[PDB]
Design a protein around this ligand. Sequence first.
Ligand code: HEM
Ligand code: HEM
Ligand SMILES: [Cl-]
Ligand SMILES: [Cl-]
Ligand code: NA
Ligand code: NA
Lengths: 713, 713
Amino acid sequence: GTSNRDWWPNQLDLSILHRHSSLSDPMGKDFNYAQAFEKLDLAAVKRDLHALMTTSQDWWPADFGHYGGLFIRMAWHSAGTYRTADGRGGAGEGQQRFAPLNSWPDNANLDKARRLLWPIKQKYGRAISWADLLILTGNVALESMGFKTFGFAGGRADTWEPEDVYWGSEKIWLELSGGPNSRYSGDRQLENPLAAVQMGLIYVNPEGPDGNPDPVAAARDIRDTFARMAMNDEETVALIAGGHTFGKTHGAGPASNVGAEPEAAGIEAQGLGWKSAYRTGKGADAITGGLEVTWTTTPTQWSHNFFENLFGYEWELTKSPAGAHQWVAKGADAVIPDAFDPSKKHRPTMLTTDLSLRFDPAYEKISRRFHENPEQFADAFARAWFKLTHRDMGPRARYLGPEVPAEVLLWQDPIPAVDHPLIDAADAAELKAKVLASGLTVSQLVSTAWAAASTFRGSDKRGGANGARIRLAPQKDWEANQPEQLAAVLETLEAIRTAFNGAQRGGKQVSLADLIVLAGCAGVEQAAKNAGHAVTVPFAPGRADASQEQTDVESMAVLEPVADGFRNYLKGKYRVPAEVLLVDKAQLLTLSAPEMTVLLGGLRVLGANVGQSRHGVFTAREQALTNDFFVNLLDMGTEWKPTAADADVFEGRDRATGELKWTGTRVDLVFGSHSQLRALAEVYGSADAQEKFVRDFVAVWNKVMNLDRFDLA
Amino acid sequence: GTSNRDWWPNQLDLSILHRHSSLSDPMGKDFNYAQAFEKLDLAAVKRDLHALMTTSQDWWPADFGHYGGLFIRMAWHSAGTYRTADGRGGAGEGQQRFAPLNSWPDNANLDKARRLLWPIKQKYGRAISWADLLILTGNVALESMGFKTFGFAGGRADTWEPEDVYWGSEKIWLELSGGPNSRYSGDRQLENPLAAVQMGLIYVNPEGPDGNPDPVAAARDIRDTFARMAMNDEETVALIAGGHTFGKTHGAGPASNVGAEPEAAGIEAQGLGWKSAYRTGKGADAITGGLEVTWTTTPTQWSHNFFENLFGYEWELTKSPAGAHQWVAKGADAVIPDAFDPSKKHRPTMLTTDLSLRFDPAYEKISRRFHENPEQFADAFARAWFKLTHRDMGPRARYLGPEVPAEVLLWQDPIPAVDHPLIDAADAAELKAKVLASGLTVSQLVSTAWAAASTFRGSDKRGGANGARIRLAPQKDWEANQPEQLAAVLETLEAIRTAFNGAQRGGKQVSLADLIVLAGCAGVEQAAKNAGHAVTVPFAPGRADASQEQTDVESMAVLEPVADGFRNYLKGKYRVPAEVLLVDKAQLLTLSAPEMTVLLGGLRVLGANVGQSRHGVFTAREQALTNDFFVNLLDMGTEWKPTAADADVFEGRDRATGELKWTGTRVDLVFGSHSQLRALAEVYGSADAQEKFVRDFVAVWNKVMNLDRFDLA
Ligand code: HEM
Ligand code: HEM
Ligand SMILES: [Cl-]
Ligand SMILES: [Cl-]
Ligand code: NA
Ligand code: NA
């Protein structure tokens, strides 16, 4: 059946903005997952998970009698899809159970692990999400095997369909580099936003880069991918050596024995895949990835043996029973236990990527320190594991349950507690009046508040106006934020704040975070007044100001908007058309197509464009909140053509006279071109729509201002 | 960007069930289009439309000074995509303005016609939908030109995205038949549910079948396609001759001058397409389809000149300036006006498909009667035009405004007015008790009510339990409805009804339509009681009973369920997998994925299956309303295999013992296979879900019962 995607494959796709509707969701409108989890008996769940570790099922028998290794792999894969570039992936939505991740080659036999969890999921029902349960299961595995974790937070709500994520352009699973859709170019430069080396891998190829078993060159890939998942050298070494303290790989026979992944398997498979024709197909005969490595002498217990082996032997290249490259210890005794036969023992083995920890000079120093100081390894691995599994969960206000660690970590972008009375409605009226009396313009106020709030992304719940990080490095210097204009606005607002706070009794004070947002509200209100409308914008106080020492400058860099169509801004020249980047930003902000449409048409006429560009400012009353953008964009009296100078800029001329009326970019004109967007634009451009436009504007403005307000959730 | 549809192109697609969410809709959640339209000043709209017919715009100048013919073409294409097989297409949702219809080749230059309407759309805003406005424009065109229409109903609410419709499998616009995705097979048999001869056409090829200009063979295609749009011979003649009383075709130059269709055009085109390089590109030089025919001597006035010409001249084959086949009267004087040059005149011309009206023997008899009696032609054309443009609008209760025709037409599946007091809650409770005391079983009651209600389809809003047409031909004999069991149930219900109605005073009586639905309610309540839960199923009286004389038997045939996965029924053996047919039927019933999932799992354990098949009845307490379907489907203790006898039937056996527990079909097992459906099944199969299952089941059951109750809107 031919579809629109077939006829027009480079059309903009808006269905990404309408995923996650109440239509697809089985829970009712009012279901609140946080409230459900807070009443779960987490201790009971954890007891059942401990029991499960050693209750082997015959359709997927436990290695060594203990599922712990399988489940730690499951949890690290759940978290391991995370990319800091866009915040997409990670464990926070339980996407491992949906396509494509449920069928990625690197997730082979994790369908078994998830099915082993069904009886527990079933018992506790809606009070524990699959997303939380995957991570909890990983923690319990660690604990069952003697490793004390740093803590755990619940609160990851389940989702009900696949997320739309760009995972690459390759059309072949696991395709090696330099193909027609290569993710690499140059000197092994991985394309953003990707964070894996091959399609359907978590991070790197365990045999080495493109299958070449060079540990030193493998280390370069590990360092780049892990960096792209927000982990530094110490965290990377602690996580790989920690993980590979446990369990084994599965490569007992040729991979051509393994059949269809879950989304390709027959209906009778009931959700499972990778059925193997090799011997019994499971257990001692299991085939997962093709390697056959067991790292330690006690694969079901925490030990210091990973580093003892890594350093204690010299390594020789060999092949697994499936033919993959791997390493064996020269001259060693058979000291490693077999997973099923108590009469068999094996020589120590390693992956190419494990040897990276010893042969990359920077990793070697870390691995040596951990080898010599195993308590330092244990503590780093606990911290790193918590970071791994919580990195996309958002502000600490979202963390639920009795095991949340009290220590505040830099990577959480922490926001100080509020310890004083908050401003009330009378005070907010007085501050808005002082803001309007200072001489700050509509355009300044709206631009500043937009810049502060619009860093939010829903993918990992980072960013937003809480913290007043707009005043700190690096946000205060970002090009999109108009550093010199921003500094003059912050200077005026900080003087207003100091004067208000100095006049208070009791401990009452306003944060600069709240004042930035309240000042934006005042700008909106004034813009409405300019247009003849009486509008109050809602404002919720309670934001606090973070310090520079609570603000990791390097980790903040991934939030910089290099494309922000809501400010008609594009930092350079990209492969992806600007309208596509607009819809991607709308998705990170959590906006639907109508909300993206209303919001952009309002921002244009309010003067939010970077550099005060006239592109898209289709009004003769700038700084007044009207639906002029829409009425004028849709006027068929105006004809549009791309300029000679720049094909991505357009001139709108009176079709009868030839006179120049407007200029616009592709972000602007897409609202008059794309058939779905133009239908939205027409609702807002109609003669009955001025009041609807204003109201809908204020609503979406307020939404954006509150996107990080998990303290109010 | 590789997607799930790329990796797994044959997986089931659920997103068709979640189109039309509150997310995509710009109007607020409480917007009610009927309330808006009822206050429209319809007469004012019509006066603006009248004016517009003769106000030419320079960017698409009006032929003959009058846009009438273009707008009649626009409205017939809006209505003309309708297929009786599934009720999809038609004018009822204004889908011409979205992809792919906005860019079909047969809709070329209709983008201009819709743009000419924007000033009026804009003026009246939400009080007149696009959907309504396309049809109303065509009525006003007819009226402006001297033709008395049969009336007009508003009430078509706008939609905000493309509907998912199967339009064919060809990958080339306008592909001739016999290709690798041919829609024809056998002796020119067009595949169901299609109703056009080539991809991107409305019905037929105006040059003849696959371009062969044989009027006689073109008549066979006309007859078949029109029949598939629900129009018989008299209606088809009246409509083609009617339409071609007006206007002209456009073929001033070679078609290679025409550029990209709207969805492929540049952003500067602002939603328009088919930009032409031939001379001025428009007006006298217009190119639309490539033919150059003007049928009558007065193209802007109703006449009987189409048939005067068709019969009054002998025709000869010739070629337009773009090279398409068409017909000329060479014997004639130059009597037809030129569209732009008052000093030019032309000979009469016809399409091959117009000559079909004279050279197919059955059409000729009709055309002759219309020729000789043009008042009969006018009346037939008015009735057919109303039918054309209203055929997918649903029950007369949805018709809005001051121009609705009072005559009730058989094609409307009419429902008699109710002139008597309705039963109240106490009466409904006494009827439910009498139905349960009669001895009718939960299975019989549920099966009957399901069979009566589940004929509904949202595509054209035909079907449903209103009317009690389950007791009439043909519904009473459909195999899915189990005609002998159905007759025994209806006989018992009719005796209950006669007894209750005979005992009333004051005119109070219950219809059989309402009693069938209330009896289904009693069955569901009793099933809940059997499981130990006291529930009340909501019930809304006011249905009426239609007579056999008010029921077109032949038109009802397209509503027969030949696949109904909710009753595990498949009438024969199809090319499309049964699970795909299930999602199709869900979409026609307007169900989301969660509602489809709850409903099917409840129906299974209530005994709704056709034939009392055990397939999917995964319970040991049949006729009790429990979540057993889901608990037992999801039990990993059971292993599934396709039977030797039938690959579409599966045995569920205890995995340890091999004992046979259950059998199921693909419709059953897809809920255990598809990763999104299995996530839904899990919610209902969890230990905390009994209450939720029952509530959600009653809610969807009630929804289904009420699908056709537009009298309560
Ligand atoms: C460079 C990064 C990594 C590479 C290339 C890698 C590679 C692999 C491979 C190839 C397997 C075998 C799969 C099979 O055939 O069953 C696996 C198993 C496993 N890995 Fe990793 N790994 C990485 C990082 C991690 C991390 C960060 C952790 C956790 C903190 C982890 C914990 C595990 C565990 C516990 C297993 C054993 C599974 C079992 O016993 O079934 N690994 N690893
Ligand atoms: C066998 C069915 C039909 C065929 C093959 C068909 C064919 C066509 C074609 C090829 C054109 C020329 C398009 C262009 O180049 O501008 C057209 C024009 C038109 N058709 Fe039809 N037609 C069909 C039925 C109908 C019906 C049912 C109606 C309305 C009741 C209709 C009303 C019109 C009108 C008014 C025009 C003139 C457009 C203008 O003046 O711009 N036709 N027809
Ligand atoms: Cl994601
Ligand atoms: Cl449709
Ligand atoms: Na994420
Ligand atoms: Na329809």
